[PDB]
């Protein structure tokens, strides 16, 4: 009857679950490197910040003096 | 000079089994003692790593007939994703018996219906360049000015097995060299158990941009050992004498000030790399 | 039992989707990395800029009660 | 076990969902600060310019 | 077995979810690491605006 | 359609301050590009000229969960003069972040004796257009002195609260001051009535050009003022159609001019009239 | 230039009917040669499709009087939504009879109250061609899901309504959606207006082969809808130098495109993206 149908749903359905896994691993893959790009590109953008951080620094630093030579004129 | 393989083949659909026959080889190479050849022929499937079996050892000739049948044991739906290799060796007494020359048949392409008997050149056998090592992926940035170089360990894969019975303690040790000599020698924490370890650790080092030419940062992916010395599972090093991907990676470090680049690199064993090292 | 292997098949492939919702959620990861990436270089251009200015200005001002 | 297996599979990939999705707010907020900021610098580097002008000129008048 | 390969491609894909977990762990820290910094710069900004403009008004005031 | 919202409300009395909750929101347009919106919820008092509170950002959700709760510093007694508004945003990266959809709660309507959290569908944020068109006749003789306003019917105009319950209110002005209330019958549920309705008015032969008639439409509300659809004004100091219409009637005396009109928004008329 | 012609206007209540007149035209151009034009009056409801009425030909005159009125057969009401086209012709012998020059009164703008008679100048009857060019950038990166546009500058414009005031409107469009609408500063006075100013889009990488976008060009009319100077439009289902340049950009990810591009019919390219 439908038992041979039964016995090759059961095949095709563990072949729908073996190719899934397969999916589930290049996806995990994809991610993984995905999530390091998305890292380094963090760190470089990090490092920007930083350098961006020290020169607000600098500017306060230096219109503080221009500050100062304003106060001389006054 | 390319030799030819007389094969047959057929699938037993009752007993859900493979019938590899191999009848005779001709026009063979004049190896082993001068003027004649000693050939014994092994075949097996290639995906399945299942013992092999060899034809009996035929003494002196050319043109060797082996008349045998060999029956695999294989189901009819998984043959689709088997293909099956031909190999015919030589033999040597004293020596290591040479591959006169393989050949394989994809399965897919075999029509099991009617029987199949067919007359096959053979070519000269692929060669493998090593035991899978590994891959270790890190950034490199350089910033001219201030003279510090930053080496962001990323992480690593597909590691060769170190510890019996186990899989893998792996561990990154960075060692900055010049001259032959080990100058500065840093290293990552210890991920325990893993073929992929994970790592996102930076490390810095002080490198003026005038000697920037003239050093040798040696990347050494390693195995912890609980007792005894840890062995090394690989290598590899950039800057001076450095080729190919490492020299490219170096080189994009270079062209990119104040930027990290992060980039893949295949390990190599620890004896080449050591010797590469001038 | 057909209900048995059919069940592990449903689950798998809840597993699946799960991994597949974080996958997407990694790509929109690197991809909004990304673009606040190339905003940081126009932040970092304007801020170089105004150090440029500031540098001049103060310059000036320095000699000019000289 | 093999259903043991898909379980903690499930559970750590729940997980990361998670702690994935925490991020990914993060980044919108980080966003949205990145687009401040921009608007900021870009006014900052308008009125720095300015000021030199100024500067300029009281310079150029005053020695 | 398939089943075998099965297993093997959840426990790979298990061990790489793990990974995407440590990855997303660091990756969070240093988002918010960055965030406070951006708060910082932003407020260094609104300080040196400021700073500017009262530079460049008496210094337009001054003018003659 | 635009969605809805769900919100808590709640008044502390002993620390005098107001407790607005958004726990979350339900069906949501698509909006942008992709399959779903980027949303996050301003919440700001409908007087207040304070600083707006808005909850945090949720990445590609239509029904996104906040859990957030603001607080105004507000007294009980002068809160009754002031409404609620929730306004629901969407995030876009390089854009203007357009507005999903909007909704305000009277306080004057809200029991801050119970803990309130409510479902309410959104309403649509923003109009471009500022109403509706009218037609009627002109009609005006200077023996007689009568001044013939025959409404004649509408149509296109906006849907107010059911559809609509459209009217016509008449209104003879001059010098500023209100004379005769006329007011025409209900069509009920329709946006283009049809009235035919014929009124009359006194107007003296020394005073047709001084004087000003201010037909307005409105929509019956059931509870609470009467809402105004459009309005529109003829005679002295109107402009456009209206001024030709009426300097077209003053032109042909004991004959109807038949004409539409647009109507305008109740605040640039009731300046106008100034 | 094209000359001016003197005109009445009457509308006759009584017997529902408009009396179009036709006095006399000054200071008309020579067209053909010999020295002077021979003029005649073509003059016809801006949407009828009757036939057209028309003066008697005068020889050989720049100043001629007709001096003739012409009848139309339209109601008050409907003649809301009509123009009048007044056509000066020259005749000619052998050839297909060249216009001196026509122009347009819409009938909402007339006061029928009073009889009308004024000088108007002629306007350019024809045009051959069917806008001007526009050059822009373009920059799409996949990973970011950024679509740039930078509006870098324009030339040879047609003049509109003083000389012309041309700003840029960028629409981003999809499945025939308007999503996005940004435009530009405007320069006034000028026909090769100068921008370079930088917009920005998201696109995702999923959505980049099914986006459309509709780069128009218009100019500022202080009273009325703008008029549209011209419109292009690159991405899916583009033509010509349009296509080119988005698969230009399509080719070079992360890197600017400048090109510049023919502007063409508002009706054409609004066809087209349907
Ligand atoms: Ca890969
Ligand atoms: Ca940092
Ligand atoms: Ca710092
Ligand atoms: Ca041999
Ligand atoms: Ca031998
Ligand atoms: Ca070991
Ligand atoms: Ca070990
Ligand atoms: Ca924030
Ligand atoms: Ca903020
Ligand atoms: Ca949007
Ligand atoms: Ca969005
Ligand atoms: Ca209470
Ligand atoms: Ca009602
Ligand atoms: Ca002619
Ligand atoms: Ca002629
Ligand atoms: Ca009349
Ligand atoms: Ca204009």
Known sequence: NELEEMQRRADQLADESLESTRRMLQLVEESKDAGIRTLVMLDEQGEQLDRVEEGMNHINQDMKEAEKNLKDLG | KLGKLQYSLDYDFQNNQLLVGIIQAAELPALDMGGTSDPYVKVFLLPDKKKKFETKVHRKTLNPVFNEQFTFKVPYSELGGKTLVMAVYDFDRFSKHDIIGEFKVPMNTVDFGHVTEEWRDLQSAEKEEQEKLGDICFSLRYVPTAGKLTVVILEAKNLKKMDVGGLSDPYVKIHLMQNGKRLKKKKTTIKKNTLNPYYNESFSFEVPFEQIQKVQVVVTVLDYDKIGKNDAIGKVFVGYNSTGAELRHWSDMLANPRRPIAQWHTLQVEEEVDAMLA | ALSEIETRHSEIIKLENSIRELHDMFMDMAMLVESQGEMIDRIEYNVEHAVDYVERAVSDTKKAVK | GSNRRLQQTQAQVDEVVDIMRVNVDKVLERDQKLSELDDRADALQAGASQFETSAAKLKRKYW | ?64
């Open chain 5, 1 to 64: 077995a398939r089943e075998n390969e099965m297993d093997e491609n959840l426990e790979q894909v298990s061990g790489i979810i793990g990974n995407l977990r440590h990855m997303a762990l660091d990756m969070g820290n240093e988002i918010d690491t960055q965030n406070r910094q951006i708060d910082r710069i932003m407020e260094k900004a609104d300080s040196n605006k400021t700073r500017i403009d009262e530079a460049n008004q008496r210094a337009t005031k001054m003018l003659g």
